[PDB]
Design a protein around this ligand. Structure first.
Ligand SMILES: Nc1ccn([C@H]2C[C@H](O)[C@@H](COP(=O)(O)OP(=O)(O)OP(=O)(O)O)O2)c(=O)n1
Ligand SMILES: [Mg+2]
Ligand SMILES: [Mg+2]
Lengths: 363, 983, 358
DNA sequence: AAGACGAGGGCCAGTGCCGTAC
DNA sequence: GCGATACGGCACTGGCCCTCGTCTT
């Protein structure tokens, strides 16, 4: 409950003091900083990869923010439900099939009169009644698995089995914040009620081929708050006894980490073949890895200062270009997980970073 | 009714055989022992019409059964024996299918080698297995060579179809296939995977070698070491189970050459075709050597194992069958997933600890760390050789705007970047591991040029030796350590000296942080060495240890991890959770290779019982198949089954990951498996060997009376009576008893019972000393007990009396030693003589325990064989479909069908009764007790497991997945007779 | 024309029968978007964010609220970027002129009763000194025009107009020829500090950034592009008895599709699943038509995959299960080729990478 | 300029300890 | 005098051998 200063100093959040847990959990926050929206960006991308791309029968859906008939959408489930028939047509009535969409939703909140918005990643899984529960447990285990990685302590993420007011099964996902558990994702099994209500005339356009027979689809639904999730990983990244020596650093997963590497200039001052830093810069961004530029600086200070400055930004590696490297071709490298000086080659550094992220995606 | 336990039997009218003097001795013994408080609880007698006996006794019954079951196979074996051999072909045919080589080794294309019997050895390219690639089989008539469909270069898809070798003939006797480790070859037979069948049985020269001249593993160790006064006499009379060695033993010809390149396991399919002729030649050499070995073994085995029950038993014990489906694949995927997840978490935490501890290198502050000061802490920065010159130092050699006119200056900086890049490469040679990081961290990382490279410090463990000392607090102390043993634990004043001095140069050590850590610990060499915990300064020596081995690392001390001492830090419940994770993946870690690679052939809808298709299950585009366990018929000792995976298969525990492996063998629709576990065999065996030795009746022994007195159902067995002392129920007490029968060593039983009961050593010692009453007593200078009434004498010549050794009172170890004394067969009953390497004639022998265990476990295995042949006899005689066997020593399960399950269970009960009556008859009397005649638990359900109720870990919901339930049995099955017309 | 109908049957747009007109498409009112159009917009936005991340020195991405902070929906994407100016000042260390880019769904009233329309626009607010604001505005003019030019099948279809007024000293507007009527695609204005001096008075001592040992309140450049109108632009730019949409390779939603030819066999599905996983492993969008279920004709299949702007169609026959050869088929040339299945990944990746040029 | 001693890493079998079943 | 019959796993290690480096002729 004191890493907030690290979020203000290094903008993963707003510099406003009024950032209470209520203001963060309601979505009434003034907004996220560049590093924060980048972190959430990589988080949502990691969602999209491990939910939409690898798994077939799942297609993107674009739901509007409002209704043609003022209050906005509370959930982007219904907007996806409106796109059921056409998406049935593009799948040739082959269910199970799902529609996924990551969009901001607007929730009315009575602060004890306002309205708070928050980014939500939703997947609506149209699945036959015969295998509804199986897909529910499936998505439970898989979502919980997706959230239990990227974490330094996966024990904080939990799942709760719960029933509806009528009896419909469902599962909730929690993250153990320092003040208790908090809801981060919800999974429910909707017994084809809303689809039936949306199409009262001809229900024949709702029938989906289960295999040897066309059945009415049961509507599974999973909605994940990525703001509370980004905050969850934000808290999880930060460090707790008899360590005898402490350093301020948040350990975010290399995949979702906002800024991957940090390029600077050492020794210092050296003119004027420093345009090689530009080369390494464009080369790095060409491969799609985030690089912070340490060119125009006021420090000119202890290396511990910008090292801690980079550790507060969860920057994986710190590449240092010096005149000796200008001579031979071996720049410096300081890892975040293990603060240790290491020499390496340039293209070797590029491929090392690419292999680092790519393998980090793996086991 | 009567004689303290008997049932209505027609196994002999006479009979007593009273032995009034012997029963007076027994009664007096049991009175002074003393047990004369009978419960008088008569078990319900069963009146049923027994199956027809062939006379005169049940001995000739089982004998004629075993003979009529193994007669055709013996005929075929004899056909292999008198086989006159045609020479090997000058060249092997490169054609798919079988190739017959008859006159002058001509190539005759054949689909199936129609022969009564043949030797066999299949080949398989491991590079893309496990599909057969080559095979050679010789017959009493001619030669045969089978090539797989891998003769044409394609991009094959292996889903294990019916591609294994075809060997069986169609109807619209009969077969015998011998081979070294024949089960593996059987696994590559096309027609063996079918639900029904089969006539074809198998004979294993390896198992046969084990029966004739086998040796224990302890013997194997010092047998291969040949490269305890008379312990080297059996060295040349026996051999290891290797084909080359067993051939060098039984044939004794020139040494057969083995493939020096190991091409079938080391090479691809490419380099196999390049050396096809040679590999075929080697396979032929193998089947030839195996043929010879078999020829020389069969009569030897027939001599050493004269009773046909062993033969037919070994015949049926080699055709096991495990039916499975897509649920197998799902099981593999889910289990491997869970394993990878838990391992990911563990390695994540450990690599985190290994990352945050790497920071205290700067500056030299690692010496203060009371855990991390033994290792390297190296700082390397190498290297370079000079080529640039000369004589000038190379170590030292805010404007606001908006310019873009230099559009291509970016390609200038790019070109400069590449031109700078290409010049440095010839400076270094080979990429070494990261020198900037300490050595302990280097070793704890994967190599850069490794195909399986993972970021950060990988290879963390659990069970490594660096990481546990890296994080854990140590038993109310500071440091852990290792040298000959890790931190000591589990498995009249005494004093020792102290010493501190300075010389150099050696790694500095710190002894303050330890004492301060102890201070912080109690904030909530001597003294505190016995029961408390502390660490000294230097030494290093024992100074108060109980275990004589050590334990790196503490991996099964959860009760000693969840009770305060010991704990870890940092920190919290991370320790016990880490131990939990280790315990969860303990099984799958040491087995996953054996289960994932556990191949399985799927039979299409073309070749399966259509009556099963008629059954309301398909199931939803589901795949049905099976796998043959691949079991060596007889592995020491005594001729017990040996199988890499299924015999060491874990049970249904909600803790272990792949614990469902046992219950993944699901019966096909319309079919169901019915099995049973003997309760108990070896105990009642030792009991009978006792009472039959002492007198005629079964309850004329102190030990033998308690065995056949307890009932497991709502009661208390002998194991359960020892487990409620207390006492720990129930497997532990079983280990204590069976360990007591084969050598109840005082310290062994000590640390064992103390490990299981968790109390203090003195009271425990009292308990042992009380339980040590059973083995007592026993027998110039000597133990103060002989045949003389008193030991003291003066110049008394009695070297002729010091030849008798025997314990007294409760137990009957004297009989087991009596079978362990005979220099000839030692086979009761039946009845097979084992090992030219343990037969005391020309052996020291000093292998006593192995031979006592040999006796009792042999009785257990002959029990097994008897059960097999008995079950087979009334399964073919009556209409009981599904005769496929799946046996695990004590337990045995048959793959019956849903409409013939109760009659099959009835067949199991009859079998057990007849076998018990056999063991009773071989020693007398034919009469037998009540609570031992019939089975108590008969499992009847789809998948095979332990208890009828089954929970599990990975699938979490067992019945959640497509499953059923089990049924206890019982007494309700004793109403369905063996006749077809029931209910 | 006959283009709006092949976006309905190929799921670029949402299902409509009356609001399918060009007027309803240009309007924010919808009948949202189809999966193909969504992926096209995501790739377009990705290339947009990529063509501004290469821009030196540093431009920080942000996100603005949609409703009113004091209680309403947003029209432009300027105010939210102006609120985070003083904060990002710390991150740029007040050193030089700097910008803030963001992509968001802004709204606009569309005129019975009147409704509300939505548009996903990409904006870039570039704070730059008054003396070097016009030059940088011309710079962004050229860079944006070239940005639209790169993925364009014709550079003549995109145009750049100049304008000015008393409120904005100089501005530029990027138009696109349809050619049913040139339409607004992007606006590039040069607003003064009046916009920023209205939300922070005072004491305005924070606003002025350092500019070479100089304190000066920065002039505000307003970049505002439309990705929906751009999507439609490239859709009309790709439309060419044949009816094939030749979208840019780096822009095309689905770039490859693989089916089977031999009668429905499990092994074919195994191989196809293999190629599926392999192609998805290297970030290549692949349409699975091997499901399938019938695989009726080849010509109408090719027509479908050409109306979906698929770069290459892959056919896995039975010969592939022998020689590994596979039936490739291009879109821009429609050349029925054959190549080994192992060298397909490298080919597609090299082909996409070869489209990386300016 | 060629030859010889020395240091580092991979592949190998051997050994100690742990893990399961009966 | 004594747990017994197996079955495998991983961590660690001394040793053979190729490769690169580097001193030496
Ligand atoms: N640690 C062990 C376990 C078993 N056995 C032997 C003795 C047995 O008689 C035989 C069968 O093992 P069981 O586990 O079945 O022992 P029980 O027959 O006594 O148990 P139960 O009554 O449940 O059948 O294996 C052994 O020697 N050592
Ligand atoms: Mg038993
Ligand atoms: Mg048993």
């Amino acid at each position: 409950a004191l890493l907030e200063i690290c979020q203000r100093r290094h903008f993963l959040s707003g510099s406003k003091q009024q950032l209470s847990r209520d203001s963060l959990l309601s979505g009434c926050h003034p907004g996220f900083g560049p590093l924060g929206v980048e972190l959430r960006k990589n988080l949502a991308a990691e969602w999209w990869t491990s939910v939409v791309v690898f798994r077939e029968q799942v297609f993107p859906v674009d739901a509007l923010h409002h209704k043609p008939g003022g209050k906005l959408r509370e959930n982007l489930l219904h907007g996806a439900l409106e796109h059921y028939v056409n998406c049935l047509d593009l799948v040739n009535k082959r269910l199970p099939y799902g529609l996924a969409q990551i969009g901001v939703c607007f929730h009315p909140v009575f602060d004890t009169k306002s309205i708070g918005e928050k980014t939500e990643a939703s997947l609506v899984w149209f699945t036959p009644p015969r295998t509804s529960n199986q897909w529910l447990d499936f998505w439970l285990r898989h979502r919980l698995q997706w959230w239990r990685k990227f974490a330094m302590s996966p024990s904080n993420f939990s799942s709760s089995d719960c029933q509806d007011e009528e009896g419909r099964k469902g599962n909730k996902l929690y993250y153990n914040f320092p003040w208790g558990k908090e809801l981060i994702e919800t999974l429910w099994n909707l017994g084809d009620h809303e689809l039936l209500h949306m199409y009262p005339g001809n229900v024949s356009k709702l029938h989906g081929r289960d295999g040897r027979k066309n059945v009415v689809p049961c509507v599974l639904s999973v909605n994940g708050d990525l703001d509370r999730g980004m905050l969850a990983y934000l808290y999880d990244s930060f460090q707790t006894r008899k360590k005898n020596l402490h350093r301020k650093v948040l350990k975010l997963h290399p995949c979702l980490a906002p800024i991957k590497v940090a390029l600077d200039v050492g020794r210092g001052p050296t003119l004027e073949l420093r345009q090689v830093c530009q080369g390494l810069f464009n080369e790095l961004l060409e491969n799609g890895i985030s690089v912070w530029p340490g060119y125009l600086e006021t420090m000119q200070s202890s290396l511990e200062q910008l090292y801690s400055k980079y550790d507060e930004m969860s920057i994986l590696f710190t590449v240092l270009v010096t005149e000796t490297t200008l001579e031979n071709g071996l720049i410096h490298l300081r890892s975040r997980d293990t603060t240790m000086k290491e020499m390496m080659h340039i293209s070797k550094l590029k491929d090392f970073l690419i292999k680092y992220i790519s393998s980090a995606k793996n086991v | 009714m009567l004689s303290r336990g008997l049932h209505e039997q027609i196994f002999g009218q006479g009979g007593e055989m009273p032995g009034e003097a012997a029963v007076r001795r027994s009664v007096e013994h049991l009175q002074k022992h003393g047990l004369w408080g009978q419960p008088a609880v008569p078990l319900p007698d069963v009146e049923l019409r027994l199956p027809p006996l062939y006379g005169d006794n049940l001995d000739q019954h089982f004998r004629l059964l075993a003979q009529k079951q193994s007669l055709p196979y013996l005929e075929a074996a004899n056909l292999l024996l008198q086989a006159q051999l045609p020479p090997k072909p000058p060249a092997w045919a490169w054609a798919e299918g079988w190739t017959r080589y008859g006159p002058e080794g001509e190539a005759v294309p054949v689909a199936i080698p129609e022969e009564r019997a043949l030797v066999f050895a299949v080949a398989v390219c491991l590079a893309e297995g496990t599909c057969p690639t080559l095979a050679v089989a010789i017959s009493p008539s001619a030669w045969y060579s089978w090539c797989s469909q891998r003769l044409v270069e394609e991009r094959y898809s292996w889903t294990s179809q019916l591609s294994p070798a075809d060997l069986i003939p169609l109807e619209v006797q009969e077969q015998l296939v011998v081979g070294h480790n024949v089960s593996f070859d059987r696994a590559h037979i096309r027609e063996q995977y079918l639900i029904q069948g089969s006539r074809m049985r198998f004979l294993d020269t390896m198992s046969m070698h084990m029966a004739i001249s086998g040796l224990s593993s302890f013997q194997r160790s010092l047998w291969i070491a040949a490269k305890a006064i008379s312990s080297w006499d059996w060295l040349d009379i026996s051999s290891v189970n290797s084909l080359a060695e067993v051939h060098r033993l039984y044939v004794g010809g020139p040494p057969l050459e083995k493939e020096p390149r190991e091409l079938f396991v080391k090479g691809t399919m490419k380099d196999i075709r390049e050396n096809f002729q040679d590999l075929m030649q080697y396979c032929a050499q193998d089947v030839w050597a195996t043929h010879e070995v078999f020829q020389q073994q069969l009569p030897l085995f027939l001599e050493r194992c004269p009773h046909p029950v062993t033969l037919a038993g070994m015949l049926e014990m080699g055709v096991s069958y495990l039916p499975v489906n897509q649920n197998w694949e799902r099981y593999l995927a889910e289990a491997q997933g869970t394993y990878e997840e838990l391992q990911r978490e563990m390695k994540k935490s450990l690599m985190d600890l290994a990352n945050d501890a790497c920071q205290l290198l700067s500056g030299e502050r690692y010496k203060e760390d009371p855990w991390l000061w033994d290792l390297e802490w190296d700082l390397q920065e190498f290297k370079q050789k000079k080529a640039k010159k000369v004589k000038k130092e190379p170590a030292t050699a805010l404007g606001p705007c908006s310019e873009e006119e230099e559009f291509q200056q970016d390609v200038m900086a790019r070109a400069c970047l590449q031109k700078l890049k290409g010049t440095t490469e010839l400076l270094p040679k080979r990429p070494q591991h990261l020198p900037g990081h300490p050595g302990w961290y280097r070793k704890l990382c994967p190599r850069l040029d490794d195909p399986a490279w993972t970021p950060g410090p990988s290879l963390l463990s659990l069970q490594m030796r660096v990481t546990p000392k890296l994080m854990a607090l140590t038993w109310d102390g500071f440091p852990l350590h290792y040298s000959e043993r890790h931190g000591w634990g589990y498995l009249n004043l005494a004093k020792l000296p102290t010493g501190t001095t300075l010389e150099s140069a050696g790694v500095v050590c710190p002894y303050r942080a330890i004492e301060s850590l102890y201070r912080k610990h109690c904030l909530e060499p001597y003294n505190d060495v016995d029961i408390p915990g502390c660490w000294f300064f230097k030494l290093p020596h024992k100074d108060g240890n109980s275990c004589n081995v050590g334990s790196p690392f503490a991996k099964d001390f959860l009760p000693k991890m969840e009770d305060g001492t010991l704990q870890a830090g940092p920190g919290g419940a991370s320790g016990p959770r880490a131990l939990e994770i280790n315990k969860m993946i303990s099984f799958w870690r040491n087995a996953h290779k054996r289960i994932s690679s556990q191949m399985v052939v799927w039979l299409p809808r073309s070749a399966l019982p259509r009556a099963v298709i008629r059954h309301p299950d398909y199931d939803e585009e589901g795949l049905y198949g099976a796998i043959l366990p691949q079991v060596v018929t007889a592995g020491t000792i005594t001729r017990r089954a040996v199988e890499p995976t299924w015999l060491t298969a874990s049970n249904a525990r909600p803790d272990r990951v792949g614990s469902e492996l046992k219950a993944m063998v699901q019966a096909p629709p319309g079919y169901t498996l019915v099995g049973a576990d003997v309760d108990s065999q070896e105990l009642w065996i030792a009991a009978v060997l006792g009472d039959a030795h002492f007198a005629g009746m079964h309850g004329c022994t102190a030990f033998g009376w308690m065995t056949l007195q307890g009932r497991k159902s709502r009661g208390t067995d002998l194991h359960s009576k020892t487990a409620t002392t207390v006492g720990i129920s129930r497997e532990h007490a079983k280990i204590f008893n069976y360990g007591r029968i084969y050598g109840a060593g005082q310290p062994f039983a000590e640390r064992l019972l103390m490990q299981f009961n968790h109390r203090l050593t003195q009271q425990e010692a009292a308990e042992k000393a009380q339980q040590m009453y059973a083995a007592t007593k026993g027998l110039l200078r000597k133990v103060q007990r002989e045949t003389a009434r008193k030991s003291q004498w003066k110049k008394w010549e009695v070297v002729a009396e010091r030849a008798w050794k025997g314990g007294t009172e409760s137990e009957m170890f004297n009989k087991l030693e009596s079978i362990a004394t005979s220099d000839i067969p030692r086979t009761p009953v039946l009845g097979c003589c084992i090992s030219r390497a343990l037969e005391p004639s020309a052996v020291q022998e000093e292998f006593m325990t192995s031979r006592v265990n040999w006796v009792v476990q042999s009785s257990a295995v002959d029990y097994l064989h008897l059960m097999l042949v008995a079950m087979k006899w009334l399964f073919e005689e009556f209409a009981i479909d599904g005769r496929f066997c799946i046996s695990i020593h004590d337990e045995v399960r048959y793959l019956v069908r849903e409409e013939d399950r109760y009659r099959a269970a009835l067949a199991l009960q009859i079998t057990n009764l007849l076998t018990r009556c056999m063991f009773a008859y071989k020693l007398g009397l034919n009469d037998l007790p009540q609570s031992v005649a019939f089975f108590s638990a008969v499992d009847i359900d789809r998948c095979l497991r332990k208890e009828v109720t089954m929970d599990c870990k990975t699938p979490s919901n067992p019945t959640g997945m497509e499953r059923r339930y089990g049924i206890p049995q019982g007494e309700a099955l004793d109403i369905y007779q063996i006749i077809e017309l029931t209910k």
